[PDB]
């Protein structure tokens, strides 16, 4: 729920301590009190039902956008753009090849977002970041 | 954790040691009750540095016992644990409740509830150990453990360790 | 807990106050003295401290 | 009839402590009589209020 | 609320209600126990 | 507010407010609540 | 476009007025969303091309995207003479906060510059354009000659007057904070009644704002 | 009438039906229906005994569900008794309910935190607890069992953490059960509450019977300086 945190079942009204502690691995409405209870002992699975990905407490952050899909798209864009940082001067002013590079990086960002070709694009990213 | 500190200790010299060379009896008795001694305030005191010059104050005769109380001030290396610190060590004993890892002069007990669930006890194997799908924790095996709680009495220090956090366990 | 009139509550708390007072000081001016089964006054802590037979 | 209407949370009934005999019947204008589990109810009896000036 | 209210008529508790939309308007007093009902004809009122 | 005259009758204190005197027993819980509200600078001036 | 809209929604959640240049907004958007100025300069064109190629029968659901494309294209191309204002309260009278984001054009000479550049001869004329030297400073254009005519009248065709005080010599003003004062409203009402009594055919009354007129007419009727 | 009054009446009816027994519900519904009630009127309506209403009035006064007024009047026969008037202080009552539920959920969170602490140990002979910190200082030379300080008996393991999720389940099984309460207080916090008193409650009472011994007219006095 946008107002209530189902892991502790606390409304924002009578329990104002709930916050937007999101996970880069799997974005969820877990509050800080639930984070400090479950994951202070160590890493565990996702407390939400229907999801069991292993997550760490130190990787937690706050969401800056209202939409979860936009937030994960922007975070994937950050995770790709860190090594993919070719500019116009990197292409020596080649405008067309810069557009092709931008299309390629947007396509691999889209593929990482929707997971249609996650393995091959992840291998391509891992080979590119070594260079 | 290893530190170097300046410590002051009250030593009660018996009147039988009131000789011309009383200072060397005081220094020798200083070592025997400090070297390897465990104090909960300052941790396990290991070695006494600056032995050539040790600040020995003028001792006060106790008004009913006759022994002389000196306030000996010395610089010594100590080992004081803390919660939330990561230390390496070797396992010296194992049981169904857990295994004891030897870090410095101290034995940290790692409880059974504070390990990954893949580890389970096996008393049939000699020596008894904990076996997992990726590693084993046996006697005289290197393991990195995070101390999450230490209890310090007046003369003993016991610490509780965990290996549930990532980048811990065997090295 | 079980409900009582305010006179009964005040009476019970006055009894508790008197018992605590005579436990700490049995010789109070203008007050009844707590007595034993034999009729002798209860030796309070103040009686145990004062006098030539006290702790001091 | 009163026993069946009591458990349906339609009426409020006054019964003796010695036996469950209906004597006086009211109307249950509120919610269900068994909405809260018993184990929470005693927890509601574990808290109190300081005074009339703080709150 | 302005047209309805508790009252004591002839040492008997009851409710006074206004029947204004009907012509002539009426003041109906009804006892809480339902013992009697008293109404007022509002046309022939002087003081 | 007008502070009542306080006098002792045994193990309890009774206060009589000034008539424009109405006498009532001051409960020990009321005195405890009022003593809880005394500021640190206040009872330090009183020697506490 | 979706992440641009979400960044705008993030920026609207503010508790105080933020006045920022378009360059600062672009830098913050790049550092928070990785959106550059150059894709923003083509936002409206790309949106129009996408809507054309989609061949959508309904465009009413996409009317709000036109405002986003307009904001994206305006704030990217223009960075000098423009200012972005974010206010937590659109109207201070409302209890619930209603945020509003205003991208306004501070330099009025920007829009009229291509008019003077394209056309050599421009004849600015109004019935009551005064002073004539304010406009060539306000809008960047040079006048070859500026002059104001005075009508030659056999008799004084119109009679202006300035009324500084009421009938009871109380000074009158239409300041917004003193609209609820009795005496100024008494003077205005008596003035309007007397002028209606002495005017033959018709009469028009002008007010500084719509809210001022609403208040004064409602309490005049009161 | 006033919708906010209906909301606070339903809130007061809900909290007594859940955490209190049937007689408490009868008393609070009597006060909510007839806004001004005395002891004799409450006994006449409920057919309740003086000793029966004792614990009920004590519990609703301890939670500030019922406020009491100590006004005495002058009947014509001059045989006046100091009748107590039971009424409700609506802002005080809703503040008390809010404070009680906030303390209950805080206590439940604290109990969840205490159960999240490791199991520890307990000695079945001397019935004493021992934490996991002090268990290690009591282990034997064989490094196999933890021995008691007094009994010198092997400690058995407690269940601090095995039922912890159950407490969370209890937490869940509270929250939906407290869901109509929190939803009611949303409209309460978003609206204005008029602070009622004995004089205000006399504007909305319902007459319990025709011949009432308790007089509802307030009698002011001169000289009282409380
Ligand atoms: Zn939570
Ligand atoms: Zn998940
Ligand atoms: Zn024992």
mmCIF file of N, CA and C in Angstrom, chain C residues 1-4 6, chain H residues 54-55 58-59 70:
data_model
loop_
_atom_site.group_PDB
_atom_site.id
_atom_site.type_symbol
_atom_site.label_atom_id
_atom_site.label_comp_id
_atom_site.label_asym_id
_atom_site.label_seq_id
_atom_site.Cartn_x
_atom_site.Cartn_y
_atom_site.Cartn_z
ATOM 1 N N UNK C 1 -9.448 -1.792 41.876
ATOM 2 C CA UNK C 1 -9.720 -2.597 40.689
ATOM 3 C C UNK C 1 -11.183 -3.013 40.615
ATOM 4 N N UNK C 2 -11.774 -3.389 41.745
ATOM 5 C CA UNK C 2 -13.142 -3.888 41.775
ATOM 6 C C UNK C 2 -14.171 -2.801 42.049
ATOM 7 N N UNK C 3 -13.761 -1.539 42.105
ATOM 8 C CA UNK C 3 -14.708 -0.462 42.306
ATOM 9 C C UNK C 3 -15.089 -0.272 43.757
ATOM 10 N N UNK C 4 -15.032 0.970 44.227
ATOM 11 C CA UNK C 4 -15.328 1.284 45.616
ATOM 12 C C UNK C 4 -15.728 2.746 45.696
ATOM 13 N N UNK C 6 -15.482 6.605 47.055
ATOM 14 C CA UNK C 6 -14.319 7.432 47.351
ATOM 15 C C UNK C 6 -14.010 7.501 48.840
ATOM 16 N N UNK H 54 -19.936 -1.578 40.085
ATOM 17 C CA UNK H 54 -18.690 -1.168 40.695
ATOM 18 C C UNK H 54 -17.462 -1.325 39.816
ATOM 19 N N UNK H 55 -17.100 -2.571 39.480
ATOM 20 C CA UNK H 55 -15.955 -2.779 38.576
ATOM 21 C C UNK H 55 -16.134 -2.155 37.205
ATOM 22 N N UNK H 58 -15.481 1.505 37.586
ATOM 23 C CA UNK H 58 -14.056 1.638 37.876
ATOM 24 C C UNK H 58 -13.207 1.492 36.618
ATOM 25 N N UNK H 59 -13.541 0.531 35.753
ATOM 26 C CA UNK H 59 -12.736 0.324 34.552
ATOM 27 C C UNK H 59 -12.959 1.424 33.519
ATOM 28 N N UNK H 70 -20.050 15.555 40.149
ATOM 29 C CA UNK H 70 -20.427 15.431 41.557
ATOM 30 C C UNK H 70 -21.408 16.512 41.991
#
